[PDB]
């Protein structure tokens, strides 16, 4: 028999066993996250060990099937997913050292707590400490002290381990026929063997740069507006022509500018739309929120939630009797088991989060017929984009008036729209230069452009040139800013956020054209539109069986990332910011106080 039939039989056996083992592991993880006990921890550890051993054994058996002798694209993709050696290609000592370094960095980031210099006994950890401090405090000295201490204590300790981590990851990637770890991360966007839809790993950098070149004017105007607002708020500490300080960005690392909405609000005389009071008055609970989300998803033509979903999901905090991680996550245990773990309370934010998680669940339910190795989003940002488009469609005032939360006589004035667009901008466009700079720095460090003695220097240079952030304290070579980030210290990709940001607005534009929406893009609601629902389901059912370029062409009609939908979405805010900055300086200079 040919090698293709043997490979198909092996894949069938692997899928059959992997479904059961992954269901066991996911059920153990769910039992742990819903009830934090030592027995649940041990069960989850045993299930994860069994799953990892199964994957290690099946990966060795898949090596005997050559990829060159496989013509079926689905079988070839499954084999490529199975034949990945990963960290098993290195020696045992190097693998143990890499695992130890990863665990040590994770513990340093998690156990790291900052103590006050005046009171050594008064110490503050990260989340209820420095995050809450940098979130709402308006003191220059306090924010500067927190920002400096967070990367002087946690920093200068991860870099001695981060360099060995980079070396080991580069060795592992070169052993896996990749140029460096950056190529190993960009391999998710790689498409081979499909004429017209191919996509190389080097093309991703070019496309991201091309998109950021077009984002540059809008982000520059937003940066000028935020700089003017901060100068009006922080006198004698902001320059009208220089960069913004790092500690005054409303966040520990400057990723999201959402916390600066209190100072950068265009019209503070009219509060934004908040249907929390309406839901409290109408006595809404978690069940009502999820039922409204289900009705929204059925209105576009997507299937309704299963009975096991309503039975097994944790939609409310179980109280003090059970310890649970209140992080909203969509759970796909496989074999028809879809659950949501969310400590839902009365809040419009929880309404949008429930819509996001139900969109994730719908994506998971769509490709359930695909093989096990293909039961994932076509790209690392597709799930996030599918969630974000539903979160956007739910937050529209039209949908809120339809579901009975806003008054039917409520008129949508221009200023409320401008405030909403500015908040969405501070949320979405503010993190694009940061993501771009972080990912580019990691890529150039992996490629060897910045070998040993220029990491912090080139990091700050790129930050000034791209994000417009100046250092309030001159950091030397011993410090390490990227290691302070969760994703960088825990070995996670970051370009996924840029890609999902682009795909979100692309999918939104496509579905609003399919729904025949007349007017601005932010007023678009895809509710009661079966055409948009079917056009989206055509992509959601594919999974990784087909290249992401083909799915993107099926949705928006393009095979690459297009930033024009984002610009069309923010065009009213762009027009307003132009008139606002007409009497102000635009741009930032790369030279300021150290």
């Amino acid at each position: 028999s040919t090698i293709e039939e043997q490979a198909k039989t092996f894949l069938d056996k692997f899928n059959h066993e992997a479904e059961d083992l992954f269901y066991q592991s996911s059920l153990a993880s769910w039992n742990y996250n819903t009830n934090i006990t030592e027995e649940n921890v041990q069960n989850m550890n045993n299930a994860g060990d069994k799953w990892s051993a199964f994957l290690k054994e099946q990966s060795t058996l898949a090596q005997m099937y050559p990829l060159q002798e496989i013509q079926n694209l689905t079988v070839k993709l499954q084999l490529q997913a199975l034949q990945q050696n990963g960290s098993s290609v290195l020696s045992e000592d190097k693998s143990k050292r890499l695992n130890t370094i990863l665990n040590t960095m994770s513990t340093i980031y998690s156990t790291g707590k900052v103590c006050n210099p005046d009171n050594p006994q008064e110490c503050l950890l990260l989340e209820p400490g420095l995050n809450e401090i940098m979130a709402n405090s308006l003191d220059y000295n306090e924010r500067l002290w927190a920002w400096e201490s967070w990367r002087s204590e946690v920093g200068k300790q991860l870099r001695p381990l981060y360099e060995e981590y980079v070396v080991l990851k580069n060795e592992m990637a070169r052993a896996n026929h990749y140029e460096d770890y950056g190529d190993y991360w960009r391999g998710d966007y790689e498409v081979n063997g499909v004429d017209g839809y191919d996509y190389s790993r080097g093309q991703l950098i070019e496309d991201v740069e091309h998109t950021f070149e077009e984002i540059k004017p809008l982000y520059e105007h937003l940066h000028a507006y935020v700089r003017a607002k901060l100068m009006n708020a922080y006198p004698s500490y902001i320059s009208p022509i220089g960069c913004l300080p790092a500690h005054l960005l409303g966040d520990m690392w400057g990723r999201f500018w959402t916390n600066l909405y209190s100072l950068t609000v265009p019209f503070g005389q009219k509060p934004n739309i908040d249907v929390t009071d309406a839901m409290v008055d109408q006595a809404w609970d978690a069940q009502r929120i999820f039922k409204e989300a289900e009705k929204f998803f059925v209105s576009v033509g997507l299937p309704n939630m299963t009975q096991g979903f309503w039975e097994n999901s944790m939609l409310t905090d179980p109280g003090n009797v059970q310890k649970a991680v209140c992080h909203p996550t969509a759970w796909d245990l496989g074999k028809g088991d879809f659950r949501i773990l969310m400590c839902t309370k009365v809040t419009m934010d929880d309404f949008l989060t429930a819509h996001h998680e139900m969109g994730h669940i719908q994506y998971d339910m769509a490709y359930a017929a695909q093989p096990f190795l293909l039961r994932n989003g076509a790209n690392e940002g597709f799930h996030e984009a599918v969630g974000e488009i539903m979160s956007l469609s739910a937050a529209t005032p039209k949908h809120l008036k339809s579901i009975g939360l806003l008054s039917p006589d409520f008129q949508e004035d221009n200023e409320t729209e401008i405030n909403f667009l500015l908040k969405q901008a501070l949320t979405i466009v503010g993190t694009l230069p940061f993501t771009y700079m972080l990912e580019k720095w990691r890529w150039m460090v992996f490629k060897g452009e910045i070998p040993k003695d220029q990491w912090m220097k080139k990091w700050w240079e790129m930050k000034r040139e791209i994000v417009g952030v100046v250092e309030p304290v001159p950091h030397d070579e011993t410090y390490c800013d990227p290691a302070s980030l969760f994703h960088v210290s825990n070995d996670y990709s970051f370009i996924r956020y840029y890609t999902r940001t682009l795909y979100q607005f692309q999918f939104q534009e496509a579905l609003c054209q399919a729904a025949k929406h007349e007017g601005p893009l932010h007023k678009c609601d895809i509710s009661n539109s079966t055409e948009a629902g079917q056009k989206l389901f055509n992509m959601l059912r594919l999974g990784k069986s087909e290249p992401w370029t083909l799915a993107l062409e099926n949705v928006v009609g393009a095979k690459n990332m297009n930033v024009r939908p984002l610009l069309n979405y923010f065009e009213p805010l762009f027009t307003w910011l132009k008139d606002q900055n007409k009497n102000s300086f635009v741009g930032w200079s790369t030279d300021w106080s150290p």
Binding site: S1, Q6, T9, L27, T306, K335, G336, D337
Partner: protein, 195 residues
């Protein structure tokens, strides 16, 4: 009045696997098909070549009741002309099947925590089964060119376990399927409906 053993087939404690489906012979009794409706949660009641209302009027010589347990997605494969792992390698109905297929959800009986691995199905076979053929062979399937001896590369066991759990989805929950084959051979009609 002599009631048929239909109660012993439908209300059995444990059912057989689809690769070892138990065929029970119904003869010399009164086939009260109205008692079958006692199991109201019927997932599917589809008769081929015969009508369920006119089933109590016709007389048959032998009635074959084939009982087994499959999953919800594979219930569609129990029909004339279907293709799949069950319809080709486990249980195949002919293109001219005269009978009715009865299925109901058994998530209460057949499901079990930590997996109910007592039900098996044949995923690999050298060729598709003939209509109403039964194969209980446990010979290791030779997928490769090398000889077959012991489990390993290209040597897979032809049987796979379902592992039913109560928290599974509706498509993966266990469904007990009873296939009633009505044969009209050159013999006196011993099976008739109630009069």
């Amino acid at each position: 009045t002599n009631l048929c053993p239909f109660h012993e087939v439908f209300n059995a404690t444990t059912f057989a696997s689809v690769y070892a489906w138990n065929r029970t012979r119904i003869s010399n009794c009164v086939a009260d098909y109205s008692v079958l409706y006692n199991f109201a949660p019927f997932f599917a009641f589809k008769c081929y070549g015969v009508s369920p209302t006119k089933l109590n009027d016709l007389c048959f010589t032998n009635v074959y009741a084939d009982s087994f347990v499959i999953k919800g997605n594979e219930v569609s494969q129990i029909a004339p002309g279907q293709t799949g792992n069950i319809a080709d390698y486990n249980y195949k109905l002919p293109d001219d099947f005269t009978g009715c297929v009865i299925a109901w959800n058994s998530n209460k009986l057949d499901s079990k925590h930590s997996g109910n691995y007592d039900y098996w199905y044949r995923s690999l076979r050298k060729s598709k089964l003939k209509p109403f053929e039964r194969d209980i062979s446990t010979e290791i399937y030779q997928a490769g060119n090398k000889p077959c001896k012991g489990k390993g590369p290209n040597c897979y066991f032809p049987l796979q376990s379902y592992g039913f759990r109560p928290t599974y989805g509706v498509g993966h929950q266990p469904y007990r399927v009873v296939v009633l084959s009505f044969e009209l051979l050159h013999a006196p009609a011993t099976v008739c409906g109630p009069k």
